[PDB]
Structure formats: C-alpha cells, structure tokens
Design a protein around this nucleic acid. Structure first.
Length: 183
DNA sequence: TAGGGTTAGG
C-alpha cells in the first residue's frame, strides 16, 4: 500500500457546480477512488472551486494524469500531484513549472548522470550544470527542464534523489526574482 | 485553482 499523499491529486479550476458526486463519477474512469471531495466554505457551503481525488494506487494516479486534459461538468480542470500541507508552505510550492533545481551534486557530475536518474520521470528538454562564469569552477548545482510540468511534480513530491551515486536535493526552480522575493 | 474541527505535552 502506497502512502495516501502519493495516491492523491489536487483538482483545481473546478466548475461552480461540481460536486463530490460529479467529481467522483468522472475520475472513477481511471481507477478505484478511496477518497473524493470538493472543498467549500464552511460558512456559506459555497464551493471553493477545488477538490481532491485519491486512488487505491499511484499507477491509477499516473493513468489519470496521462489522460489530460480533464473536463468535468463542462469545465477544463487542472489535476496536479497533491503537495502536502507541510510542503505547501515552501515558496512556489504550487507553481506550474517545467524546470527543477538540483543542488548538492559532486564536482565530477556529468549530464549522463542526471539523465540516468531523471529520464524515468519524463522527456528532458534541457540540462544545465552550473559553473562560475568567471573562474569556471563547478558550483555544485544544476537545472533540468522537462516537457511536462507533471514530471516536475512527480519528482519534487519524493524525498530522495540519487545522482552520480549520492543523494541530492530537488526543488521547483524559482526565477532570479522569485528567489529574491523568497529571501 | 492548496485540504476536510489535520501539527508541540514530565
């Protein structure tokens, strides 16, 4: 049995009239829903326009994501890997991005090392191992861009990543300015 | 379009 967090998808952009029932009826097409709910105001009971669906297995989750775009109650919605309440605190945790920051990679790390680990998550468009433009010294971090934002989401929700023999930290890439506003 | 009375007590 895989962890609940990894078996759940956040469903954003829900139609004003989507319900626990209409949501379920749609996503059950890709698996056994162990949970399905529409978040709404506790006071007015008005829909907050988003919800979650949870499958019995991550394979069923992958099936659902491979079926995008998803239209529910006539509205195109936005299914996303569910980011934990804890991680939802980090800056840009909910951004739709196709690039990741990979920090703490050994000096002798080469592109093939990155591909050997990251290709399993999706089509890689660009790989950039950073160096100091002036000294030419390796800075110990890289950037990897994918063709699908879900590749990035599938990655950052995992805790560990082994590249060139050792663990490395992987986060959603924030722009120069986002990093600044994040400081 | 970020969570459902779901987060520090001898």
């Amino acid at each position: 049995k895989e962890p609940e967090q990894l078996r759940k998808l956040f469903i954003g952009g829900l139609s004003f009239e989507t319900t626990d029932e209409s949501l379920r009826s749609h996503f059950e097409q890709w698996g056994t829903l162990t949970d399905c709910v529409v978040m709404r105001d506790p006071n007015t009971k008005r829909s907050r326009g988003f919800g979650f669906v949870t499958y019995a297995t991550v394979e069923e989750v992958d099936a659902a994501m491979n079926a995008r775009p998803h239209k529910v109650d006539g509205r195109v919605v936005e299914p996303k890997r569910a980011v934990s309440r804890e991680d939802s605190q980090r800056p840009g945790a909910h951004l739709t991005v196709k690039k990741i920051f990979v920090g703490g990679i050994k000096e002798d790390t080469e592109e093939h090392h990155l591909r050997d680990y990251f290709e399993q998550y999706g089509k890689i468009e660009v790989i950039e191992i950073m160096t100091d433009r002036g000294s030419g010294k390796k800075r110990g971090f890289a950037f990897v861009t994918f063709d699908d934002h879900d590749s990035v989401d599938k990655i950052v929700i995992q805790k560990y990543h082994t590249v060139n023999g050792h663990n490395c930290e992987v986060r959603k890439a924030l722009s120069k300015q986002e990093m600044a506003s994040a400081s």
